[PDB]
Every structure is written in C-alpha cells, then in structure tokens.
Amino acid sequence: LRELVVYIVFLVDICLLTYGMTSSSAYYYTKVMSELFLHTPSDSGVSFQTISSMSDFWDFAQGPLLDSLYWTKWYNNQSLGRGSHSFIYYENLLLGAPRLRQLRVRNDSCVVHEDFREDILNCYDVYSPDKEDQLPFGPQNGTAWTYHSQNELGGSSHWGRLTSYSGGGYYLDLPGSRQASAEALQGLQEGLWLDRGTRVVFIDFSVYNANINLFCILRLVVEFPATGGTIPSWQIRTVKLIRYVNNWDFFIVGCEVVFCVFIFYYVVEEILVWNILDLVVILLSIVAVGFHIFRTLEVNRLMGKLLQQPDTYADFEFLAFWQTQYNNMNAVNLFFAWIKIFKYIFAIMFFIVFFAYAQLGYLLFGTQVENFSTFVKCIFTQFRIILGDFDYNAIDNANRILGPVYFVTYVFFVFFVLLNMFLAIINDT
Amino acid sequence: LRELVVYIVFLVDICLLTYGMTSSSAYYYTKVMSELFLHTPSDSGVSFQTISSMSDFWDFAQGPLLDSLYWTKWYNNQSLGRGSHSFIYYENLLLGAPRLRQLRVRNDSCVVHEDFREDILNCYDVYSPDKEDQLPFGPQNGTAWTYHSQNELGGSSHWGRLTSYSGGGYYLDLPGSRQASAEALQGLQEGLWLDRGTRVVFIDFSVYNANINLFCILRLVVEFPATGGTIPSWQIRTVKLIRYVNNWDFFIVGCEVVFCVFIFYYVVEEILVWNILDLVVILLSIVAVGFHIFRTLEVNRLMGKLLQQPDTYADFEFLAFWQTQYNNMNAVNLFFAWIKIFKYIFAIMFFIVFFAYAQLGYLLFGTQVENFSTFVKCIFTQFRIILGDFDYNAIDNANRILGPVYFVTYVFFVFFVLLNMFLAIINDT
Amino acid sequence: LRELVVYIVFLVDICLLTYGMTSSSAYYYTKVMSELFLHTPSDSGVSFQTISSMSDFWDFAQGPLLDSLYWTKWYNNQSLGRGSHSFIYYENLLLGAPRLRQLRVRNDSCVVHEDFREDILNCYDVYSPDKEDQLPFGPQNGTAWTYHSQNELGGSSHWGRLTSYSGGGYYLDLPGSRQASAEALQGLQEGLWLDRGTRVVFIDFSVYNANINLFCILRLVVEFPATGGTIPSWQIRTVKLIRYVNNWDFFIVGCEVVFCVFIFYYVVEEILVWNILDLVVILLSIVAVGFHIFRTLEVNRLMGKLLQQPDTYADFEFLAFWQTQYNNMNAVNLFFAWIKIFKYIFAIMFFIVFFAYAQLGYLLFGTQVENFSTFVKCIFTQFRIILGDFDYNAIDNANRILGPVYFVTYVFFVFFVLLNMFLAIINDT
Amino acid sequence: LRELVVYIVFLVDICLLTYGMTSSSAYYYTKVMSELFLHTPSDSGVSFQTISSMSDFWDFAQGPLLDSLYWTKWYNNQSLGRGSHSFIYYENLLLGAPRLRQLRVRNDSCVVHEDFREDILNCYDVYSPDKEDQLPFGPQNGTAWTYHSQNELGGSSHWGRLTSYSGGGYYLDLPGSRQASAEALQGLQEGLWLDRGTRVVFIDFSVYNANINLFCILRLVVEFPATGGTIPSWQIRTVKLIRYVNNWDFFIVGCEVVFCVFIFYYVVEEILVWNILDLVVILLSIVAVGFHIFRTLEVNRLMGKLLQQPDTYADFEFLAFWQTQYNNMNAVNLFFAWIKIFKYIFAIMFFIVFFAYAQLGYLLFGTQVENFSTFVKCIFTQFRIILGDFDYNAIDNANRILGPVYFVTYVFFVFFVLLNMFLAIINDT
Ligand SMILES: *[C@@H]1O[C@H](CO)[C@@H](O)[C@H](O)[C@H]1NC(C)=O
Ligand SMILES: *[C@@H]1O[C@H](CO)[C@@H](O)[C@H](O)[C@H]1NC(C)=O
Ligand SMILES: *[C@@H]1O[C@H](CO)[C@@H](O)[C@H](O)[C@H]1NC(C)=O
Ligand SMILES: *[C@@H]1O[C@H](CO)[C@@H](O)[C@H](O)[C@H]1NC(C)=O
Ligand SMILES: *[C@@H]1O[C@H](CO)[C@@H](O)[C@H](O)[C@H]1NC(C)=O
Ligand SMILES: *[C@@H]1O[C@H](CO)[C@@H](O)[C@H](O)[C@H]1NC(C)=O
Ligand SMILES: *[C@@H]1O[C@H](CO)[C@@H](O)[C@H](O)[C@H]1NC(C)=O
Ligand SMILES: *[C@@H]1O[C@H](CO)[C@@H](O)[C@H](O)[C@H]1NC(C)=O
Ligand SMILES: *[C@@H]1O[C@H](CO)[C@@H](O)[C@H](O)[C@H]1NC(C)=O
Ligand SMILES: *[C@@H]1O[C@H](CO)[C@@H](O)[C@H](O)[C@H]1NC(C)=O
Ligand SMILES: *[C@@H]1O[C@H](CO)[C@@H](O)[C@H](O)[C@H]1NC(C)=O
Ligand SMILES: *[C@@H]1O[C@H](CO)[C@@H](O)[C@H](O)[C@H]1NC(C)=O
Asked: How does the record describe the protein's post-translational processing (chains A, B, C, D)?
C-alpha cells in the first residue's frame, strides 16, 4: 500500500507540471484575436472567412488586415506614446514583421486532352511537391518574385485542407509602418503575384501579450485549388513559451527535477498488461523531459534574433506548433495517469456492411454534400447519424430518390443489428 | 474455396473500375461553381436563391449572371491573353453558349367561375403537357418568341419540384461577348418574355476544367406557379466524361475488357436466394457495359459540334444526366458486391395507425409547414420525429391546439407500441 | 363480413369527400403570399416580423404594405390592361378593400400607486373587454375616430398571443387606388391614431386566385401590450370556398347525398366501447353535413355584397375561419375512420413530481426564457427535454447556478423513474 | 388524516403567497426592454452585443443608448405632454439618473519579463481587488476621474463572466436631458476615461411601469480583459417591489400573518428523514418572513430619496437582486412543499474515468472552443454529449486528429459502461 501512496505523489507531480502550463485567460485571448482578424469586414463586405476569388483576397489584404495590424493612435485620435511599435488592442506587442509566402506550380504540369489543344495552351495541375515551380516570374527581382528553398526559410510542412505543403516559396516581409506596407502589397497587385500558377498563400505573424504572459501565433492559409476559387482557413495558437515568471518558475525547475527523479525511480522499478501502460506513460514522460531544454534553446535563439534585427520575420510558428503538440502529449499522459489508478487499487457482419454504407454514401453523395466528400468524413458522418445528429435536407437535395433510401435503410440496419445484439446478450444470460 | 478467390478478384475489378471514375477534387469544383452563381448578390441584394417575383428574375439575369459568366480581364484590370473565349475563374472554359428556354400555357386553359366572369377574362391553368401553348407571341419573330418542339431541341424531361416538364419551349441562345448578351436580354425585357402564361424558365450552361479533367454542367430552374411568385431551384453536376488521360486510360480499356470477361464467366457459371442477388448484379453489370460505347459516341458527336459551330448551345445536360445516374448504378452494384461476400463465406397495427397519422398531419398542417405539404414528405417527417429530429415551433404555430395533440399523441403511440414489441420479443425468450 | 365491405365503402366515401377539398397547390400559395407581406423590408429595413415600436409600424404601413397591395404596371413599366382592380402578382385578385381596426382602453383604468401620483396622471391597464374605451378621440369625426360595436361590424373573437379580443373597435377602410390610401394613412399619422390607449391593431384583407380556385384570407395582428413595444403576429389561411368547378362538382353533390344516405344507415343500425367511437364519428359527420348549406348561403351573400358595393370591406375572415376548422373536423373524422377498422377486423409519483418541475421551472425561468413563460409552455418544454430537444444556453444564462441544477436534476429524475418502470415491468414477467 | 388536511391548507397558503408575486406580463416586459437596448444598431452597425473594441463602446454610448433612454416627442414629431421626465416607450418612467462606473488596475501590477523590458514599460495585470487602482487620473477633478470606495457608493459584488467585482470605482451620473448627457460622455471621450488600466465598465439604470406595476432594473456590464478587446454582458431583472395594489394587498397582509401562524404551528409540532425536509422548508420559510419588512423599509427609503433629489442615482440594483433571489427561494420552498406530500400520504469506475475525460477535453480543447474553456463547462458539455446535444464541427476543427478520437472514445465509454450496468441490474433479477 506504500507504492500506492508514492503513485499518488506522482499524480500530483504530473498534475502541477501540466496545469502549470495552462492559463484561464487563454480562451479569451484567442477569441479576441480571431474575432479581430477573421470577422472584420472591409468596405466591400469582405471578411476573411468569406473570401471567394482572388480580387476578394486583394480586397482583404489591402483592407482590414492592414488596419487590424498597425495601431498607432487612440480611439480619441490622440497619439499613443510607445515608439514606432504596433500594439494590437494597445495591450499586445507585434513580434517582428508579418510574412506572406506563396507556392507555384510548373507551367506545363500535365497533358491537355487532344480535343481542346486548340483553345487551351497550358495545364497547371494540382499541387504536389514534385511539380513545384522554382523559376522566377513577374519582374523577377526581389525575394517576393524569386524562389526560396525550405532551408533558406526555416520551416516545416503545413498540412491544410487539401494536401500537405512544403516550407519554400516566394516570401515577402512587410515593412514596419502601415504606409510602406500598403506600398508593398500595391506593388504586388501591380504585377500579378497571384496568377494561374498559384496554389497556396500563407500569412504568418505572431503577437506577445505583456500583461499576462502568452503568445498568439497565427497563420492565415488561403488555398487556391486547381478548380479556381479559394478555400480560406486559419490556425490560431496561444502558447506560454517563456515559463519564467517569478520564484514560482524556480519552483517549476524544482518540479521538473523532481519529475525526472520520479521517472528514474520508475525505470528502476520497471526493469526488474498494465505494465504496457507503464512503459507508455514513462515513454511519453521522457519524451516530455527533453522538450524543455529544446524550448529554452529555441526561445533564447529567437529573442536573440528579434533583439538583433527587427523588421525581419522570426519564426514562432515551428516553436508554437511543437509547444501545442507537447501540451497534447502531456494531456494524454495525465489522462492515462488517472486511468492507471485501477492497477494500484458476430460484429463482423456489422462492420463489413457499415463500411459498405460508408462507400455507397461516398459515391452517391460527396460531389454535393461536404460531410460525405471523403471516406473518413463518411465514416464519422454515419457515426453521428447513429448518435442522432444529421441534416436530412442535404442528403435529400443531393439525390432526392436514393437519398431517403440510404437514410432509411441505414437506420433500419443499425436499429435491427443492435436489436439482435441485445437478444444475443440476453441469450448469454 | 477457389471460387471465393476468383470472387475477390471480381471485387477488385469492379472496385478499380468504379473508383476510376471519381475524383477527390470534384466536391470543391461544385462548391466553387455553385457559390459563384447562386450566392453572389446583385446591387439590389438579389441572389439567385432569394428570387421572389419576375422583376427580381430580370434583376438577376441582367445582374450577376452576366458578370459571373463572361470573364475578360484580370483582377488588376489587365487583359487576359486567351482569345475571345470566356474563362470562369480563369481556370474554367465555357463550352458553347448558354441557353434560356421557357414554357407557356394556353390562353384560356380552364373555366373561370361564374361569379367572377366580369372581372376575370382569362384562366392560365397549372402546367400539364396537354395545355402547353404552341403559338407565337410578342413580336413573334426570333426563336425566342416562337415555339420549338422537343425534337428540334434534343432534350429529355426535366423533373422539378412541382411537376415534370418537357423539352420544348421558346429558347434563346446568348451570343459570345457580354455586351451583345445584355443587348439580348434587354430585348427580352422590352417586350414581355415573361407574362402570365409563363410557367418554367431554364438557364442551361456547362463548363470544362482544363487542369484536372471534369465538366460542371448546370441548370438553373426557376418555376412560376399558377399562384404567382417564383420557386428557384438548381442542379449542378460535375462529371468525368472523357476518360482518356494517359496510358492509364488504356489500362482502363484493359480493365473494361477484363470486366466483360468476368461477366461472361458469371453467366456461364450462372445458367447451370443469393442467386437472385447474382442475377441482379450481373444485370446492372451488363447494363453498365454498353454505356461506355454510348458515351464515346455521344462525346465524339458533341465535341464534333462544338468544333464545327461555336456560339451554339450543345447539350451536355442529357449526357451528364445519364453519366451521373450511371455512377449511381455503379455505386449500387459495388455495394451489393460487398454484401455478396456472405454467400461466399402484429406490425400491421403499427403501419395502419402510422399512415393514419401521415394522413392526419397532411390534412391539418401542409397548407402551412412545408415538411407536411405532401404525403411522402409527411411519411419521412414522421420518421424523423421517431429519430428525434423535429421543429416544434412550426407544428405549434400552424395550429396551436391540434399541434401539440398531434405531436404528443404520436410520441406516446410510437413509444408505447415499441414497448409492447419489446415485451413480446422477451415473451419469445 | 358484409358489414365490413359496406364499411370500406364508407371509408372511400369520406375519403373522396375530404380529399375533394384540398389542393396540392395550396402550400405554395400561402408561402408566396406570406413571403410577400411579411418579409419584404422597407427602406428603413423594417420587415413586418421585425416591427419594434409604433414608429416602425407606421414605417411599415406606409411602406411595403401599400406597395405589396396595389399592383398596376408590369415589371417593364408597361401598364397592365385590367381595369382599376389590383392584381397581386398579376395572378391574384384583391377582394373588396383592406380594413384596419384598433382597440382602445379607458383613460383611467386602474389606480396609480400612492408614491407616483405626482409624476403619473394616467393608468391604461391591460386589455379586458370590461375596460374597452368606447368614446371618440382625435378629431372625433370619421369611422376611424369613433367606436363601433361588434354588431355594426360583423365579427367574432380573434384569439391572439396575449388574450382574446372582441370584434368592435375603430375601423378604417382603405380606398381603391394607392394614392388615396396613402392620403388616408398619412391622415391617421397626422393625428395620433396610435396613442397610449391602443392595444391591438388588425389589418384584414383577402385575395382570390383565378387560375386555380382558392382564397388567401389573411390577418396581420400587431399587439401593443401595457408594457409598451409591440408583438407582431399573423394568420394566413387559404381556403377552397366555392366548390363549383365542373360537372365534377355535381359528382360532389352526389357524393354528399350518398354520405348522408350512409349516416342515416348508420343511425338506423346504431340505435338498435367501439360504439363510443361510432357515435362520435357519426356526430361529427352530421355536424359536417349542415356546414355546406351554411357555406353556400354565406358565400352567396358575400359575393352578393362584393357585387353590389366595391371598395367596402366584406368579411371573408369569419367564413374562412370556420371553413378551416371544418377541415380540421373532417381530418379527425377521417383519422378515426381509419382507426375503426379494428372493430370490423406508480405513475402518480411521476406525474406529481413532473408538474412540480413544471412549476419550479416556471418560477425560476419564465421572466427570461420564452419557452417557460407560461405554465402549459413549461409542460411541453419539459416534454421536449425528455425527447431530447432543448436549448441549454437559455436555461444557463437565465440563472447560471439554479439552471444546471434544474436541467441535471430533471434528467436524472426522468432517466431513473423510467428505469424503475422497466424493472417493474420485467418483474411482471 | 387531519394533519394531512392541515398540510393541504399549508400548500394553498404558500401557493397563493408565491403566485401573488409573479405576473404574466413580466416576460414581455423584459423582452421589450432588452430588445430596446441590446439589439438596436447605431449608424455604424454597432449593437450592444456586438461591441468589439473601445471605439465600438464609445460608438454605442453616444449612439443608441442616448436615443433609447431619453424620449421626448411622439412618432409624429409632436411633443409629449409629461414634463421633463423621460418615458421609455411612452409607458415607462425612468427612475433617477443612469450611472456609469469603472474599475481601474494599478499602473505597475506585475513584473514584465526580462527580455522585453526595453519595449514594454508597464504591466496592467488581471483584475483582483488587491491591485485596484485608487488614485485619480485624467484631469483629476470630478467624481468620474477620482476614486470612490464601496461605502460612499452603496453596493455589493457584481459577479460577471471573468471574476467578481467590488462596488467602488469612478462613477458618473448622467444629467436629465439628452443634450447635457451627450456633453458629458463627449467630455469623457475628450480625455481618456477608458485606457489600458480599465477593466470593467457598468451602466446601471432602472425603469418603473405605471400601467401594470413592475420595475425593470438593468445592468449593462462590459468587461475589458487583460488581453484587450471586450466581453459585453447584461442582466435585466423585472421585479414587483411595491406589493400595495388594492384591498387585495391587505388580503396579502392577512395571508402573510396566516403564514407565520402556520410556521409557528410547525415549530410547535416540530420540536417534540422526512423531518429533514421539514426543518429545511421551515428554515427557508422564516428566512422568507423577515424579507418583507426588510423590503418595505428599503423601498420606503429609496422612494424617499427619489422624492428628495432627482437626477441622482438611487440604487434599485441591490434591492432587485435580493428580491429575485428571494423569489428563487420561494420557488424552491414551494417545490419541496409539493414533494413533501409523500410523507403525508461500481459507479466509481464511471465517475473517475468521466472526470478524466473532463480534464482531457479541457486540456486539448478549451483554448479554442468555449464549451470546454473551463472545468465545470467541460463537465456539463460532456453531460450534454451523453444527452445527445453536441457540435461536432467545433471539436473537429479545434484539433482534427485528437478530436474524433475524443468524441468516439467517449461515446463508446458511456455506451459500454451503461450496458454493463444494464446486464448487472438484470443479474440482480
Ligand atoms: C484626427 O487626427 C488627425 C491626424 O492628422 C487630425 O488632423 C484631425 O484633426 C483629428 N481629428 C479629430 C481630433 O477629431
Ligand atoms: C511557361 O512558363 C515558363 C515560366 O517558367 C515560361 O518561361 C514559358 O515561356 C511558359 N511557356 C510558354 C509557352 O509561354
Ligand atoms: C531590382 O531591379 C533593379 C533594376 O536593375 C536592380 O537595380 C536592383 O538591384 C534589383 N533589386 C535587387 C534586390 O536586386
Ligand atoms: C481599368 O480598365 C479600363 C479599361 O478601359 C481602363 O480605362 C482603366 O484605366 C483601368 N483602371 C485601372 C487600371 O485602374
Ligand atoms: C388568347 O391568347 C391568344 C394567343 O394564342 C390570342 O391570340 C388571343 O387573342 C387571346 N384571347 C383574347 C380574348 O385576347
Ligand atoms: C424579324 O422581323 C423582321 C421584320 O419583318 C424580318 O425582316 C426578319 O426576317 C425577322 N427575323 C427573322 C429571323 O425572320
Ligand atoms: C416608367 O413609367 C413612368 C410612368 O409615368 C414613365 O414616365 C417612365 O418613362 C417609365 N420609365 C421607363 C419606361 O423606363
Ligand atoms: C381621459 O380620457 C378621456 C377620453 O375619454 C378625456 O375626455 C379626459 O379628459 C381624460 N382625462 C384627463 C384628466 O385628461
Ligand atoms: C367631418 O368634420 C366636418 C367638420 O364639421 C363635418 O362637416 C363632416 O360632416 C365630418 N364628417 C362626417 C363623416 O361627419
Ligand atoms: C419635427 O420637429 C422639429 C422640431 O423643431 C420641427 O422643426 C420639424 O418641423 C418637425 N418636422 C415635421 C413635423 O415633419
Ligand atoms: C504609473 O501610473 C501612475 C498613476 O497612479 C502615475 O502617477 C505614474 O507616473 C505612472 N508611472 C510612470 C512611470 O509613468
Ligand atoms: C474642476 O477644476 C476646476 C479648475 O480649478 C475647479 O475650479 C473646480 O472646482 C473643479 N471641480 C470640482 C468639482 O472641484
């Protein structure tokens, strides 16, 4: 019964270590930033979410995005007394400069069919890293008009709605004030910096809050499919990077070294079914150990760069990405750490036909309704239908005969099979 | 156990043949075109979905529809360098010309009642093909003002929300550029090309995407009932017609001939309960065989016509219609082909009263709520109520006494009968 | 087994008689008229549903309502060739003239409390027919400014959202054209025809469709509570009044006399448990017999009046009211007539506590959330909660402590009691 | 069986006493006032709910709020004949003057991190009563620019969305007419009366309805977090304070003394399991006794003040607060009083894992989705998921891998554990 007590001590160790990272003021910080950039219309009624075509994109970029970044003067039109830096909502510092970057696809990327070769001289295929266009275009001069590899821009794969994307492309870094920035983007509308070759466009920038201590790092990802049009999407992550606050941070250093003491104790007692869960928990634990040194190194380097050369994009997106997935790992560890307490204290006919419906629904619908438009989405759509959440209008207007047949037939299937499962389990009794 | 293996080979045959037709880039192609034509307002705030009366229709036709068809210049107001053809979203070619066509009903189509014969000199009845008005009207000159049979316009029945419609009517084919087109439709507003006689108005046009290979064929169907007003509706189908891409298309020809080899094998082994499913699967299989020759002939002919005489409507709607229903057939075949693996490895009291509620609900509601407005819609509405999806406000504001009596009473009926079914099945145990 | 056959003959008799009244084109007729009057905004963005205060009402009455009534010219601004009458959507005749009528409450209707007698010289209480103000006001001249009893205006009780209302009040009948009408309502804004005394305002008018045969009779009821503000509400009923169409109407006369033959047969065989249902069905049958003579008399009289003196309100609202409730009666008869085929072929602990929750929820909520704002609404709200339809945000923002306690506690109550019912019924087995 | 009868007499006593307080016209009174202040946009499209930043707040305060308070002239632009007082909707008197009051936080409230000390000279921390800034600011002159304790302003804690707030702060009391008021708030925009130090801003005012007898007391609470931006929120309570109406009020005095007679009878019979419920009911009863004297004293004093010095804020918010919570207490008493009739006539595996999901969901989501943003909200969110109310899009866009794993895994957990509970209970049978 002593190993139990020690185990509890482990639960409060991991508990304080993971709840040390969070903040109850995070949610409103995301909510405020997102509702600042996403929802604010331009004069043309162009929000970010509602971007349709390219001209809408330019109406957005030269629109709110240049007035929701650079704040200078108060609401009473009196100047704000902090020099030359842009404070979003007066309370939020803007780190470095924002960066656009684009991805292009090669001029002739496929074979136009034989009938149309008269009217169509070019094929720009869907994005795949094999076909990415590395040559310059436009006036072919600055870093906006000429390619850059994934090394020259330190970066990882962004994984969007269509397909994953590399880290290269034609970046531009907006200058400090507003006016110079508008001169830039106006310069990119002059020439065509968005043409048929374009595929993905990223806008990255990050913000640091002085009052509490948090970063809001955000990516605005607009995709241009081969079909034309646009698909806007966004990721906004708020993150506690610097863990130094007060002597409490030194209590967090002590907490960390206590934690590694614990894990060494648990590898000692480990080596000599539930022990599966043990080796997992310890595995993700020691994965979580080194990340703090990784982080302190990273932050030290970045704040080094921002210190040296302002008006230069400094990547917080990689660091924020791995910080948040680090938090996900801690969450799963902690959850298992609660499950572990218990250690210290015919269906094939259903699955086959189930996937058969997933497939059928994907074929009949899926060029109409989004919820069916891929296979996994079909699986979870059918699962919600079991749980009693569905939109029948969509299924019914996609195909107004086979729709009701699908819906009804599926309902009777699940209902009926579930029944036979009940009667079988009662037969076991 | 060998016939099993051969059967699996059949499953991968049909599998690759049906998944050969689809594309994962289809959904966004429909989504983009539909959100281009349907949702874009005019200056008057007139979307397509929101069309109310005739003047709204004309505000739409001379509105966005002429600016969401003809694209000429880039977003920077630089000319686009492809000659005279209209590329929607710059990536999508426009095939031929768009076509309006109308259906009229005869001047005196019924008997005005005896009381009103003083104030009402005309009856235009509901549309039925018996009463379709074949005489010219207006200035009585062009092909817009004079009837055309269903042969002179190759076409099949469109089946809309009210009733099915023929393929005849008074067509107009818009010219190439925008300006000439606006001159046309302005010419049709000058005279009354929509008058009390009108019933259905169709706008048909189709689009071919060069980057991927797909067609988006779309019909915009606005109905004018006898009651006045309008009911806008639409059908948008994206279709892979030309299956020739690369040598992979030749692997698709080999796949097809392998498939017919399979079906001949299965008629040989067939002729000498589950065999019901066998004869069905083979039936729809051989139905699916000839459609490819039918299609290659059709496409060959059409692209022949578009080749010969541009600015002439060339029907892709018939071909797209049968291509999509062909895909539905393949979907059902494939689904059965998955079910078939298993071959190789008191209620009357409920139904009577159920339909009795369907009828009651249709009579009490149904001049108010849409979900009840016909009989089949009542059946599926009550079925959703069983599944726990309903809008109680509607039922309650239609009739605020009998509404709750209907809803409650029905709930207790289904609940209670289901109970007695449980207790009965437990009695069988 | 012969009485069975005769009974079936009864089912097809009542079946054809009740389905003779309906029309499948009704729903779109209501939908079109309602979306014409209710939803069309004015220049100020004032729809009918969105009416807030009195100035909004006047912005509506002189707004769309005078342009959604009088139609004169086509969409091409060419005159329409039917003399002086107003055709709504060109297909719908307007019967007679529209009528406003108001209800007033007496000057000093209650006792102002003792503290405020200095600042408040008048009390206008809630509407009850005892306090209705019968004296003239304003310029005190026309029929708009002077009272009229419920006899001088033939009319019945309208039953709205707050309380039932009589048929008297200060009516005004709008003239024929638009311009004279605007002169009228402008004349009623000049003086105050809506002042603190006002309680209910009705706008009644009816429309006859020539193409099909139906009436759309509609009431727009705006209520001004004692609290101030407004509560707009509406009733739109489409009705087949004249049943004369063709010789088929004579087949309907034969059908009626066959029906009365049947009911006499059933009183003969009746007089000499399920017979309860028999006497009910026959009762509502013979109630339904005389209504046709009542109706033919009524319609004959009305069309007499419209024939004699146009530009005079002629009530179709009484007749439409009883026609629709007649249709409800036929619906219930027919439903029982289907049930009748079978003739020819611990809870107190739950109900007490249930009503106890209805009461509690009414007291805690109900000055906030509408669904709880009266007692019956609380009953059906809790019933939906059992059926899994609820809005938790409302309950939670009304009182953010007792709300979740109510919701959770109720859920466990119903869940748990239902359980004990299951185990009890299994004990009976 | 006599104590039963006497008990019923108790039920009708408490019944008439609690139903004496309510009114069926309350709901529309809240609904009307709330839809007057909350939803009415300004010229800039700024509603109250939609307030985003500070400049939006000022656009609201000088916007509708000064035109939804002071009513002078009728809708026909004729003057209203009640002197100098402002009648909202002409039927509602405005009691006293409205009051703004603010809360500030100290200049340097925390330690800026070491890296940023160059660009950031100030930390304004989250609100806690320890850090509240008591010094004057701005021109440092009036009662708007200088602190006031919680005694000098009689007031209690407001408990908002973020944290509880004290009653002190920098109040301003708007003058009588509109013009002087606009001069005031313009004077507060001139200087910065909202600066980085601000945290909460309250607008309090109350309204008395003469026709019925009720008060609508309302607080408009706008919060400025440390993160920037705003969180608007509101409380609107309608209350019957003065219970004097007619001789019926004297029947209410008799009712009260009868009630205390009852409770003395029940302490006599009390002193000599269900008796737990007895001592509770009697406890809250005698708590409810003294509140009437407390109230009559309070109202007497207030109406004394409003009598003496108009244009001075007189607090009805404290009194309304305790009146409504008094009504909540009566509601619970009455509910128990209905329950009481009956007196006179393995799970740990589920709860542990349940809270484990609450925690996991709070960590993974909760910086994205609101429903998860705190721990209790996670508990009730998961409880609704059990009851079949959820938004899957949110969970899925927060984290698009771990989201479905959370949702599915939780569903199988609850489903499966519930099953084993069924089979266990059947084993007990
Ligand atoms: C707003 O600021 C501009 C900055 O140049 C100034 O010219 C203008 O007078 C200001 N308007 C005000 C204070 O109303
Ligand atoms: C295709 O694009 C390239 C850009 O890399 C350009 O140099 C070339 O001229 C284009 N081809 C044609 C036929 O214009
Ligand atoms: C841009 O083009 C001009 C024109 O020759 C050239 O002088 C300049 O160096 C170019 N910019 C860069 C960064 O090379
Ligand atoms: C837009 O194009 C028109 C075409 O004639 C031209 O006259 C005008 O100057 C252009 N406006 C620009 C480039 O801003
Ligand atoms: C009815 O319509 C026809 C069109 O086919 C027209 O020729 C005829 O004159 C119309 N009847 C009357 C009475 O105007
Ligand atoms: C249109 O009417 C004119 C007037 O006579 C005629 O010359 C012309 O041929 C008509 N158009 C056609 C296509 O017949
Ligand atoms: C619309 O009708 C009016 C009626 O007087 C007329 O003056 C005007 O010219 C017409 N406008 C057109 C036909 O565009
Ligand atoms: C009350 O209203 C009546 C209208 O019937 C009016 O004659 C009377 O003068 C009013 N009372 C007062 C005190 O103005
Ligand atoms: C309206 O008032 C005038 C003024 O005396 C009067 O002549 C006229 O008769 C009145 N109208 C009616 C319908 O009595
Ligand atoms: C509205 O009231 C103002 C108040 O001065 C007055 O000048 C104006 O003429 C009035 N407008 C009307 C009655 O239309
Ligand atoms: C901080 O705010 C106070 C207001 O209480 C002010 O007196 C002081 O000057 C501020 N500090 C600095 C460094 O400006
Ligand atoms: C406001 O400031 C002026 C300037 O000295 C002063 O005279 C006045 O008394 C101040 N107001 C109050 C209420 O003290």
From this structure: Palmitoylation is important for expression at the cell membrane and for channel activity.
Q: Between C and D, how many residue pairs show a Cβ–Cβ distance under 8 A? A: 140
B104 SS3 class:
strand
Find tokens 């729903």 and name the residue: C27
Q: Helix crossing, C54-61 with C178-190: angle to 10°? A: 160
The residue contributing the CA closest to ligand 3 atom 14 is A141
Question: In the Cβ-directed half-sphere of A386, how many Cα atoms lie within 13 Å?
Answer: 19
A335/D55 CB distance under 8 A: no
A52: contact with B, CB 8 A cutoff:
yes
Experimental determination approach used: cryo-EM
Q: In the numeric block, which tokens belong to residue D134?
A: 């008591």
User: Which residues, at least 6 apart from A9, have a Cβ–Cβ distance to it below 8 Å?
Assistant: A262
| Amino acid symbol at C258 | V
Q: Closest Cα to residue A85, out of A71, A75, A74, A99?
A: A71
Q: Which residue of B has its CA nearest to A386?
A: B387
Measure the CA–CA gap between C231 and C49, rounded to whole angstroms. 9
Whether the CB of B85 is below 8 Å from some CB of chain A: the reply is yes
Residue D417 CA to residue D111 CA, distance in Å, equals: 49
Return the SS3 of B355.
helix
- Whether A68 and A181 have beta carbons less than 8 Å apart is answered as no
- Count the neighbouring beta carbons within 10 Å of the beta carbon of residue A212: 20
User: How crowded is residue B49: how many other Cβ atoms within 10 Å of its Cβ?
Assistant: 10
Around Cβ A290, how many Cβ atoms within 10 Å? 9
Chain A contacts of D55, Cβ < 8 Å?
Answer: 75
Nearest to B343 by CA among B256, B259, B283, B281: B281
CA distance C257 to C263: 10
Neighbours of B197 (CB within 10 A): 18
Q: Which residues pair with C205 in a beta bridge?
A: C218
D142 lines ligand 12 (CB under 6 A): yes
How many angstroms away from the CA of B267 is the closest CA of chain A?
A: 25
Instruction: Give the minimum alpha-carbon distance from C25 to chain B in angstroms, rounded to a whole number.
Output: 8
3-state secondary structure (DSSP) of residue C201: strand
Q: Which residue has the tokens 């991190």?
A: D113
Which residue's C-alpha comes closest to atom 10 of ligand 5?
B107
Q: Which residue is listed with tokens 């070294």?
A: A257
B391 is an annotated ligand-binding site residue: no
Which residues touch C368 (CB under 8 Å, ≥6 apart)?
C394, C397, C398, C399, D27, D30
Question: CA–CA separation, B22 vs A360, rounded Å?
Answer: 13
Distance (Å, whole) CA C171 – CA D257: 51
- Chain A stretch 314-373, residues whose beta carbon is closer than 8 A to a beta carbon of chain D: 327-328, 330-332, 334-335, 338-339, 341-342
Residue from B140, B141, B143 to probe ligand 6 pocket by mutation (most atoms less than 8 Å from CB): B141
Dump the DSSP string for A130-144.
TSB--S--TT--SSS
Q: Within 13 Å and on the Cβ side, how many CA atoms surround D246?
A: 4
Supply the residue whose CA is at minimum distance from atom 9 of ligand 9: C141
CA separation for the pair A308, A45 (Å, rounded)? 40
State the resolution, in angstroms. Answer: 3.4
Tallying the residues shown for chain B, one arrives at 429
Cα D294 to Cα D321: distance, rounded to the nearest angstrom:
13
**What does the block give as tokens for A156?**
């990882």
Q: Which of residues 107-166 of A touch D (CB under 8 A)?
A: none
Nearest chain B residue (CA) to C94: B119
Round the CA-based radius of gyration of chain D to a whole number and report it: 27
Q: What is the DSSP letter of A154?
A: T
Q: How far is D374 from chain C (nearest CA, A)?
A: 14
